[PDB]
Enzyme design. Sequence first.
Site, mmCIF file in Angstrom:
data_model
loop_
_atom_site.group_PDB
_atom_site.id
_atom_site.type_symbol
_atom_site.label_atom_id
_atom_site.label_comp_id
_atom_site.label_asym_id
_atom_site.label_seq_id
_atom_site.Cartn_x
_atom_site.Cartn_y
_atom_site.Cartn_z
ATOM 1 N N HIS B 358 0.800 -0.931 0.149
ATOM 2 C CA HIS B 358 -0.154 -0.032 0.155
ATOM 3 C C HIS B 358 0.999 1.493 -0.078
ATOM 4 O O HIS B 358 0.472 2.246 -0.125
ATOM 5 C CB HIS B 358 -1.162 0.267 1.413
ATOM 6 C CG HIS B 358 -1.932 -1.323 1.240
ATOM 7 N ND1 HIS B 358 -3.287 -0.741 0.509
ATOM 8 C CD2 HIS B 358 -2.160 -2.315 1.790
ATOM 9 C CE1 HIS B 358 -4.290 -1.851 0.927
ATOM 10 N NE2 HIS B 358 -3.242 -3.204 1.828
ATOM 11 N N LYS B 549 -9.036 14.409 4.500
ATOM 12 C CA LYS B 549 -7.828 12.710 4.219
ATOM 13 C C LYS B 549 -6.839 13.252 5.350
ATOM 14 O O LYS B 549 -6.984 14.439 6.354
ATOM 15 C CB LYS B 549 -7.093 12.695 2.820
ATOM 16 C CG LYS B 549 -6.469 14.426 2.642
ATOM 17 C CD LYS B 549 -5.580 14.492 0.534
ATOM 18 C CE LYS B 549 -6.653 14.711 0.112
ATOM 19 N NZ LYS B 549 -7.100 13.140 -0.648
ATOM 20 N N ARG B 550 -5.775 12.591 6.161
ATOM 21 C CA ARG B 550 -5.403 12.802 6.839
ATOM 22 C C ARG B 550 -4.253 13.690 6.661
ATOM 23 O O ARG B 550 -3.222 14.012 5.597
ATOM 24 C CB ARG B 550 -4.913 11.370 6.661
ATOM 25 C CG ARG B 550 -5.549 9.748 7.737
ATOM 26 C CD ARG B 550 -6.083 10.566 9.631
ATOM 27 N NE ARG B 550 -4.603 10.626 9.712
ATOM 28 C CZ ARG B 550 -4.408 9.365 11.238
ATOM 29 N NH1 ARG B 550 -5.096 8.441 11.312
ATOM 30 N NH2 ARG B 550 -3.366 10.364 12.117
ATOM 31 N N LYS B 555 0.794 14.177 0.953
ATOM 32 C CA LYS B 555 -0.870 15.398 0.632
ATOM 33 C C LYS B 555 -0.537 16.098 0.098
ATOM 34 O O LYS B 555 -1.801 17.046 -0.147
ATOM 35 C CB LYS B 555 -1.810 14.090 1.771
ATOM 36 C CG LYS B 555 -1.945 12.722 1.813
ATOM 37 C CD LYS B 555 -2.903 12.575 3.115
ATOM 38 C CE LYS B 555 -3.060 10.639 3.055
ATOM 39 N NZ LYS B 555 -3.639 10.342 1.764
ATOM 40 N N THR B 657 -8.892 6.499 -1.901
ATOM 41 C CA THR B 657 -9.601 6.389 -2.772
ATOM 42 C C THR B 657 -10.649 7.461 -1.879
ATOM 43 O O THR B 657 -11.706 7.368 -2.581
ATOM 44 C CB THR B 657 -10.119 5.098 -1.276
ATOM 45 O OG1 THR B 657 -9.790 5.058 0.061
ATOM 46 C CG2 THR B 657 -9.601 4.143 -1.335
ATOM 47 N N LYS B 661 -13.939 8.834 -4.125
ATOM 48 C CA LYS B 661 -15.513 8.922 -3.622
ATOM 49 C C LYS B 661 -15.942 10.097 -4.358
ATOM 50 O O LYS B 661 -17.395 10.294 -5.076
ATOM 51 C CB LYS B 661 -15.343 9.246 -2.251
ATOM 52 C CG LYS B 661 -14.767 7.530 -1.224
ATOM 53 C CD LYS B 661 -14.523 8.136 0.278
ATOM 54 C CE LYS B 661 -13.995 7.037 0.137
ATOM 55 N NZ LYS B 661 -13.458 6.970 1.786
HETATM 56 C C1 LIG Z 1 -12.163 7.069 1.535
HETATM 57 C C2 LIG Z 1 -11.382 7.796 3.772
HETATM 58 C C3 LIG Z 1 -9.495 8.390 3.838
HETATM 59 C C4 LIG Z 1 -8.897 8.031 2.657
HETATM 60 O O1 LIG Z 1 -8.940 9.306 1.841
HETATM 61 P P1 LIG Z 1 -7.598 9.411 0.439
HETATM 62 O O2 LIG Z 1 -7.903 10.770 -0.018
HETATM 63 O O3 LIG Z 1 -7.618 8.361 -0.722
HETATM 64 O O4 LIG Z 1 -5.915 9.412 1.731
HETATM 65 C C5 LIG Z 1 -9.474 8.198 4.877
HETATM 66 N N1 LIG Z 1 -10.589 8.805 5.663
HETATM 67 C C6 LIG Z 1 -11.988 8.475 5.669
HETATM 68 C C7 LIG Z 1 -12.291 8.185 6.949
HETATM 69 C C8 LIG Z 1 -12.110 8.081 4.203
HETATM 70 O O5 LIG Z 1 -13.519 7.446 4.396
HETATM 71 C C1 LIG Z 2 -0.101 2.943 4.623
HETATM 72 C C2 LIG Z 2 -1.666 2.797 3.781
HETATM 73 O O1 LIG Z 2 -2.595 3.046 4.504
HETATM 74 N N1 LIG Z 2 -1.055 3.580 2.831
HETATM 75 C C3 LIG Z 2 -2.847 3.972 1.895
HETATM 76 O O2 LIG Z 2 -3.682 2.905 0.973
HETATM 77 C C4 LIG Z 2 -4.355 3.034 0.699
HETATM 78 C C5 LIG Z 2 -5.340 1.946 0.587
HETATM 79 O O3 LIG Z 2 -4.880 1.239 -0.128
HETATM 80 C C6 LIG Z 2 -4.619 4.217 -0.794
HETATM 81 O O4 LIG Z 2 -5.222 4.178 -1.322
HETATM 82 C C7 LIG Z 2 -3.086 4.953 0.004
HETATM 83 O O5 LIG Z 2 -2.809 5.441 -0.804
HETATM 84 C C8 LIG Z 2 -2.035 5.116 0.614
HETATM 85 O O6 LIG Z 2 -1.373 5.748 1.429
#
Ligand SMILES: *Cc1c(COP(=O)(O)O)cnc(C)c1O
Ligand SMILES: CC(=O)N[C@@H]1O[C@H](CO)[C@@H](O)[C@H](O)[C@H]1O
Lengths: 805, 811
Positions: B358, B549-550, B555, B657, B661
Site C-alpha cells: 500500500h 484525508k489524514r 498529501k 480512495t 468518492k
Molecule cells: C476514504 C477515506 C479516507 C481515505 O482518503 P484518501 O484521500 O484516499 O487518503 C480517509 N479517511 C476516511 C474517513 C475516509 O472515508
Molecule cells: C499504508 C497506507 O495506509 N497506505 C494507503 O493505502 C490506501 C489503500 O490502498 C491508498 O489509497 C493510499 O494511497 C495509501 O497511502
Amino acid sequence: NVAELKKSFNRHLHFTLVKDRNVATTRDYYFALAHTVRDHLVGRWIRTQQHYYDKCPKRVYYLSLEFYMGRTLQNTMINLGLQNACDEAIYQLGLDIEELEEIEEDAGLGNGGLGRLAACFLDSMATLGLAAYGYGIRYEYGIFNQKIRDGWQVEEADDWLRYGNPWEKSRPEFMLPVHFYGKVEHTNTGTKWIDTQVVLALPYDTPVPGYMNNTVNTMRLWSARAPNDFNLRDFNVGDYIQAVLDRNLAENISRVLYPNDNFFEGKELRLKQEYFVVAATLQDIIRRFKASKFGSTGTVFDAFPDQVAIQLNDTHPALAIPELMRIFVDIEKLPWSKAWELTQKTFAYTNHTVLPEALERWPVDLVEKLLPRHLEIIYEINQKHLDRIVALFPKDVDRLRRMSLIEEEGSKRINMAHLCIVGSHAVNGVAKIHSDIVKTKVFKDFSELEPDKFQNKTNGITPRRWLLLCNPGLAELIAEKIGEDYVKDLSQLTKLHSFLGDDVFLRELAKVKQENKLKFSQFLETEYKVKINPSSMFDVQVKRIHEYKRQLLNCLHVITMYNRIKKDPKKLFVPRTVIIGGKAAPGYHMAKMIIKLITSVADVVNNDPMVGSKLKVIFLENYRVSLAEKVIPATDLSEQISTAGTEASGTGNMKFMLNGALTIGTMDGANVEMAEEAGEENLFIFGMRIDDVAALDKKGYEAKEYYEALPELKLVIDQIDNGFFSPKQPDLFKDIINMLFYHDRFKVFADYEAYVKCQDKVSQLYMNPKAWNTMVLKNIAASGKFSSDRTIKEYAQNIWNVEPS
Amino acid sequence: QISIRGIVGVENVAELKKSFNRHLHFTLVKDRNVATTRDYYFALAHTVRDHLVGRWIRTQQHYYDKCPKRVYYLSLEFYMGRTLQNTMINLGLQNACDEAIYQLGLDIEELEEIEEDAGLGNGGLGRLAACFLDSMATLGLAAYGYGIRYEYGIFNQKIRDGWQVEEADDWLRYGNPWEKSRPEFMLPVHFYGKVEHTNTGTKWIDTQVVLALPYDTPVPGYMNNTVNTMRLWSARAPNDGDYIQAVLDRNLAENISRVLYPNDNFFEGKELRLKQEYFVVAATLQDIIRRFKASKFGSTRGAGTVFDAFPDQVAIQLNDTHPALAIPELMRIFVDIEKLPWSKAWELTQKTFAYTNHTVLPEALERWPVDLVEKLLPRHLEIIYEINQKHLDRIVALFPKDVDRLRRMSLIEEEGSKRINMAHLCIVGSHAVNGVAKIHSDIVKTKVFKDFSELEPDKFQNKTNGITPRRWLLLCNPGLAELIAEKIGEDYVKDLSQLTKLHSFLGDDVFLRELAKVKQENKLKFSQFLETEYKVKINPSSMFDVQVKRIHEYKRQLLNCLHVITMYNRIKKDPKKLFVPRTVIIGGKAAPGYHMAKMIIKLITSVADVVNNDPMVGSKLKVIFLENYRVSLAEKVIPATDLSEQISTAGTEASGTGNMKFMLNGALTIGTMDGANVEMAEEAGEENLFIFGMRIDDVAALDKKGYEAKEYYEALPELKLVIDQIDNGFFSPKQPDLFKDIINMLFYHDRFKVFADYEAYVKCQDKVSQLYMNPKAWNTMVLKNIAASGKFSSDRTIKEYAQNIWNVEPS
Ligand SMILES: *Cc1c(COP(=O)(O)O)cnc(C)c1O
Ligand SMILES: CC(=O)N[C@@H]1O[C@H](CO)[C@@H](O)[C@H](O)[C@H]1O
Ligand SMILES: Cc1cc(C)c(NC(=O)Nc2cc3ccccc3cc2C(=O)N[C@](C)(C(=O)O)C2CCCCC2)c(C)c1
Ligand SMILES: Cc1cc(C)c(NC(=O)Nc2cc3ccccc3cc2C(=O)N[C@](C)(C(=O)O)C2CCCCC2)c(C)c1
Ligand SMILES: *Cc1c(COP(=O)(O)O)cnc(C)c1O
Ligand SMILES: CC(=O)N[C@@H]1O[C@H](CO)[C@@H](O)[C@H](O)[C@H]1O
Ligand SMILES: Cn1c(=O)c2c(ncn2C)n(C)c1=O
Ligand SMILES: Cn1c(=O)c2c(ncn2C)n(C)c1=O
C-alpha cells in the site's frame, strides 16, 4: 405455557445467540433459557418502578460493599413460579436443565456472612413488597476461585463476566461523576472542592424478583470508567498510547473485591472503592428523590428522611454520612444543623463484629490526601460531638478520648464505627448476645447518652434459596403436610411439631436426607476420587477459614477419631464423612496453614487401610453460594464451634438447621437463639460460655496445662509437631503449634475436652435413627425465627419505618 | 426492496413496529415514558440485526454444504463507520424501517446519528478493507474479515486554541448491538519464552499465554442472500506476591487489544504493536485451520491431517505487511505442530498467502529489530532466518557473482541494529504481490522490488482500488442515487459501469439543472451542520473546495494552505475585483506524535481566523478546518463538495480512495498525476480533470538536479508574500516565530517539493474558478466524471482479486 417456553427458548437461541441448533453449545442453551426467564419479569420490573413513582412509599436503600448473590437462574425460576414448566420445556427439547444451570457463574461479590446477609435481604425485601434497592460495586472479579495444589490453597481470578451476564442491564445514561484528591477553598459562595480527579460510575441493574408476587426490585451495582472529556489540564504532553492505557488506573477501582473476611486492610484502593460506591449511590438517591412527587414544594429536602432510608452494611460505607453532609451543605446550600438533622434521620448502621482486627481505622493522612473535604466535615462532626460531651461531663477528660472519632496515638486514625454511631439514628447488632456486647461494653459511652439508638435485629436467611431452591425434597415434603404458607411465613414450620410421633413421616424425613446424601456423594466421588460410605454421618464445617471459627479444633477431633480407630480397630465406631471447606484470605498465613494441615490429615486418614470406610475426610474446594446449596441439604451434623463471644451471629448455622442437620456448637452468636427456639437439649451445646472465657482471660490462659492434662490431646499435638502428617516436612506445622501454645487468642485446647465428649454424644444419638430424626424435626419445626422475612419486618417496623405491601 | 404498501407491505411495517417495541421492553427494559433517543436507536438496531440472522445462518450452512474456497482478509484495521443504515439498505429494509419509526412518532435521522463510528482504522487502508467486505458479501464470496476488536479506535479529534487535541474514542461505552461474542472459539496465543532444540525437534517453551476471544459482526451483501462475517479478536488474561496486584496486572494482557495505533503511512516499532500483529495472526491462523479440519475437505492419514488441499480451500490476503507474521506462524504450525516437512510446508504457505502493498514511502515500511522479535517471538526469528537462508541460497545459485544482490534481497538489514524487512518476507512467502493502482504497482514491480520481480515476473500484479457504491452513493447521497435511478434504472448499483449510460444526457439542460439541484441540496444540509459547529456565516452560492484525508506532508494540505493565503492576499490587494467565492474546507486527523502535521493544522486554523474575520473579505472566502474527520462525516461532506483536492506529490500516493468518492458524488477533481488520479483521468478524459504540476519523471529529474526551494520563493512574488506573512507572524501576531519549523522544512527539508508545484497549482486553481462561473460547462464536466466512475466500484476490484489471486468465483 410449556409450549410457549419452548418457542421462546428457540427464539432466543436463534435471534439472541445467532445459533443454529447444529452448532449450539451448552452455554448457548443456558443463555437462551436465562433470557427466556428474564423476559417473564420485565413487565413487573417496569411496573414496580411505576408503582413506586405513583404512590411514593418511603424507599429503603441497602448500601453494601458486598452482595454475595450466587446464581440467579434457578432462584428466578422459583420466585416467578416457572421452574416446573421450564424443567419440562427443557426436557422436551432433549436437554437437561441442571446441566444448563451449572454453566452459570456465581455472582461472588462477597466474602461471607456480611455479603450473604445483603443477598438474603434483597430477596426478603422484594417478597415483602418493600420499595428497596441494593447498591454496591460491580467488581469485575469477585471472591477468587480456590484450587488446592499439593494440599495448599491457590487463588485464581474469578473471571465471572468473561462470557457476559444475562441478568444485568447497563444504564450508561445514568452515569455519575465521582471526585478524588484535589483541594478545598472556603469561598464567599460556599466551600469548593476543586482540581479533583474524576472517575465515572456506570450503573448495572439486576432484577430482584419477589417470591410469587408482583414485585421486582433492583440491585444497582456501579462500575468504574475513565472520563473522555479533554480538560485544559491534559494539554500537558505524554505518549498518546500510554495515556489511553492509563485509563486502566481509574477503572481499577471496581476491578476486584478485597477478599478479606473480618479483617481490615488500610489500602488506598479500598478507600477509593468505599467512596466510589457511596458517592455514586447518594447522588443517584438524591436524583430520584428530586424527580419524584416530593421533589418540589420550604426546602425540598425536609421530606427526605420520610422518603429515604439508607442502611449501612458495616462501616465500609461509613463515608456516606459526610458525603450526604457535603451534598447538603456545599451543593444544596442547606445550613449545617438542618443537614445534620436530616443525615441522622436518614442513616442507620449495622455492626457485624467485635473482633478488633476487623474494625476500620483509616489514617487521617490518607483521608486528607484522597478526600480533603470529607476530613474537614468529619473533624466538624467530631468537634460538635465532643463539645456536647464536655458540656455533659466537664470533669471526664478520658471520656472525650474514648468517644472521639479520631484516635491520636502517634499515627492518627479515624474510627469509622464512631462516625457511624453519631451519624445514624439507629445502630444494630446481628444477634442478641452480640447486640448486647455492642451496646453495654464496646459502645457503652455512646449507649448511656442515647439508649434508644442501639437495637437488636437478629440475622436470618431466605427460605427460597436456602430451602425451596437447595432442598426441593424437603420443601415438597413439608408442603404436603402443612401447605405452603411457610415460604412467606416460616414461623408456620411450628405446625410440624404435630408430627413428632408420626413414625411414617420420620422415615420420609430421613429418606429426603438420604437422597440428598446420595446425590452429594456422587458429586464427591466425581471431584475427589474418594469412596464415600453412604451410611456414614455427614459431619460438615463450611465457612471462611479463621482462627476464631476454629476449623483447627475440628481438625484435632478428626485426628482423635483416627487414633481411637488405630488403637482398637475392632471397637464399635459410628462411621463419618467429615467435610471441612472454606476460603482463606490470601494474606492470612495461619488460615493457609490450617488448610494444609486438614488436607495433610485427610491424605493420611483416607489412605490408611486399617481405617477404610469408617472415616473419610474431605477438604471441600472453592466453597461458595452454589456449592453451599449442594452440601448443606446433605448434612447431618453442622459444626458451629467458634469461641464464645467471637461470632456476631452466623447464618450458615441457620441454613443447616432449616435443612435437617443437628448442630454441635458453642453458646455463641445466633446459636444461643437456636437453642432458645428448639430447646437447648435438642442442640449439642458444649464448651466455655462468654463468662467462662472472661474468667480464663483474667486468670491467664496457659495452653500447656491442657496438653499435659489430656493424653489424647498430647498424642494429637505430638503427631502434628513431629511430622506424622508431614513426613517429608516434619517441622511444617511449627507456626500452628507455636500459636496454639503461646498466642492462641481463641483457646482451642480449653474447649477440646468438652468438644470431644460432646462429639461422643452425637455418635451415640446417630446410632438411634428414631431419636436422631425426632431431634431433627424439632430443629426444623423451631427454625421459623431465622427467616430473613422476620428480620426485614423488624428492620421495617423499628428502623426504616416502612410497611410490607 | 421490501414493500410498505398492500396487505403484505402494511404487515411488514407492523411487524417492524412490534419488534421495535419488544426490544425496547424486553431488551432495553424501558417503558416509553423514560426511553431516550439512544434506547430507540438500540431497539431499532436489534430489530434490524434480527432480520439478517436467518440469512447469516443459511450463509454458513451453504459454505459448509458446498464447501467453496474460503477467502480471509487479514487486517489490523477495519474502518467500518456506522452499520445501521448500511444494513437496512443492503437488506432492502430502509423504506420499511423508516416507515415504522415514522409511525412510532420518531425521527429516523436522529436515531441514526446516535450510532458510534466503528473507527477501527486510520484512513484508506482500513477503509479499503471495509469496502472490500461489503463487495465480497455482495458478490457472494465465502470471505471472512479478520481483525482486532480495539476497545478504542482512532481518537476523537477536537481543536483547542487552534491545535489538535486527542480524546479517547470510547466507542463501546453503551455497547455494540451488531457484534456477537463466540466464547467457544476462544484460542490461546503465546509470547516471549524461549526455543529448545531436543530429540523430538523444536519446542517453544516457557511462554506467557494470552487468550483471544472472537466477536462476530455480520457483513450483509447488497440485495442477495449472503451475510458474511467480520471476526474481531479481543485480548483476555488466562485463569492460571500481592493477590490484588496479580489481579490488576491482568490489564497488561488485555492491553494488546486496547487501542488502535493512530499512525497512517508511518512505522512505529513499538513492542505493543508487534504483540498486536502476532495476536491477530496467531488467533486467526488457528481458527482458519480449525474450520479447515472440521469441513468436508478435512481428511486423515498416517501422519495426521492432510493439508495438501489447504491452498485450494484457503486464501489469506495480507493487507500490507502488518500481519506479515502470518507466514512464519503458518510454517511454525505446519512444521513444529503438524510435523510436515519444511519443503511441503513452505510450498503450501506460498500457495495460501497473497500480499497487498500500500505504500512506497520509506518511513511507512515495517522494519522490526531482530532484538525485539528475538525476545517476543524467538521461534519466529528462527523460522524467518531459515526462510531467509533458503531464499539466499537459491539466489547465490542463480547469480553467483552478484554479492550485492544478496544484500538487497535479504529479509535482514544487517547494518547497525539488524532489522527484519517485512515486505521481503511477504514477497517470498506469497504467490502474489499487488499494488493498489497502475502507477504504484509499476513502481513496486520495476523499481522497489526490481530484483524480486525479475526472478518471478508472474508474481507481481496490479489491483486498482475501489469504493463500494452502496455506502458511498446510495447511503451518503440518496438525492444523487435517486436522480441516476430516474434516468437510467437501478442496475448501476450492482454494475457501476452502467453509469456511462448517463452520457445520453450530455446536452440536456434539464438534467444539468437537476444535477446542480442535488448538489445544492447536499450543500444546504451540510451548511446547517457547519454553522451550528463553527462561528462562520457560509456563503451558499460559494464553491465548496474540500481536502479531507489524514494530515500529511506528502498529501500537501500545506500547498492548499499556501493557495488559500494567495487568495486572501488577492482580495486585500483588489477588494472590488471579481472573485469567484469559495468555502475552503480542510479536514483530517494528525497522528499524535506527528509534529509537522500538528503544526500544519495550527497554520490552517490560524489562517482561518484571519480570513474569516477580515471584513474586507466578507462572504468572498471562508476557511473551515473540519474537526474529527471520519467515515460517517466523510458521508456528510463528500456529497456537499464541488472541488476535490487530491494534490499529493507525484509518486507518493499509492492510490487514494477519497478521490473516487468525490468523483462518484458530483465533484470535479484538482490533482496531480498520482495514484488512481491517473486512472480517473484515463476514464473521464484528462481534459475533464484539473491536472497540474510535476509528474513522476519531473520529480525524478528535480531530485537528480537537487531541490532548492528558495529559487521558487525568489522567482514567484506571490509565494514570497505568502511565506513572509507566515514567517514574520502575520498569522501568529502574539507568537511571531510560531511557524518557524514549517518555514525551516519548506526551505531546507521539503521531501515533497511544495514550492515546485505552487505555480502550476495556483494557475490550475484560476481555471477551476473560471469554469465554476459557467454552471452549464461546470456540470457538463461533472456529468462526464460521474458517468466515467464505474471502474472505481470495489466490486470491479474484488472480481479481479478473485479471478487472478484467490481463484474463487462470484456466486
Ligand atoms: C476514504 C477515506 C479516507 C481515505 O482518503 P484518501 O484521500 O484516499 O487518503 C480517509 N479517511 C476516511 C474517513 C475516509 O472515508
Ligand atoms: C499504508 C497506507 O495506509 N497506505 C494507503 O493505502 C490506501 C489503500 O490502498 C491508498 O489509497 C493510499 O494511497 C495509501 O497511502
Ligand atoms: C461466523 C458465524 C456465523 C454464524 C451465523 C454462526 N452461527 C451458526 O449457526 N453457524 C452455523 C450454522 C449452520 C447451520 C447448518 C449447517 C452448518 C452450519 C454451520 C454454522 C457455522 O457457523 N459453521 C462453523 C461453526 C464455521 O466455523 O463456519 C462450522 C464449520 C464447519 C465445521 C463445524 C463448524 C456461527 C457459529 C459463526
Ligand atoms: C432500576 C431501573 C429499573 C427499571 C425497570 C428501569 N426501567 C424503567 O422503565 N423504569 C421506570 C419506568 C416507569 C414507568 C412509568 C412511570 C415511571 C417509571 C419510572 C421508571 C424509573 O425507573 N425511573 C427512574 C429511572 C428511576 O430510577 O426511578 C427515574 C430516576 C430519576 C430520573 C427520572 C427517572 C429503569 C430505568 C431503572
Ligand atoms: C452462609 C454462607 C456463609 C456464612 O457462613 P457462616 O458459617 O455463618 O460464617 C459464608 N459463605 C457462604 C458461601 C455462605 O452461603
Ligand atoms: C465482618 C463480618 O463479615 N462479620 C460477620 O457478619 C455476619 C452477618 O451479620 C455474621 O453472621 C457473622 O457472625 C460475622 O462474623
Ligand atoms: C492475621 N490475619 C490476617 O493477616 C488476615 C486475616 N484475614 C485476612 N488477612 C490477611 N485475619 C483474619 C487475620 O487474623
Ligand atoms: C516524521 N513523521 C512522524 O513522526 C509521524 C508520521 N505519522 C505519524 N508520526 C509520528 N509521519 C507521516 C511522519 O512523517
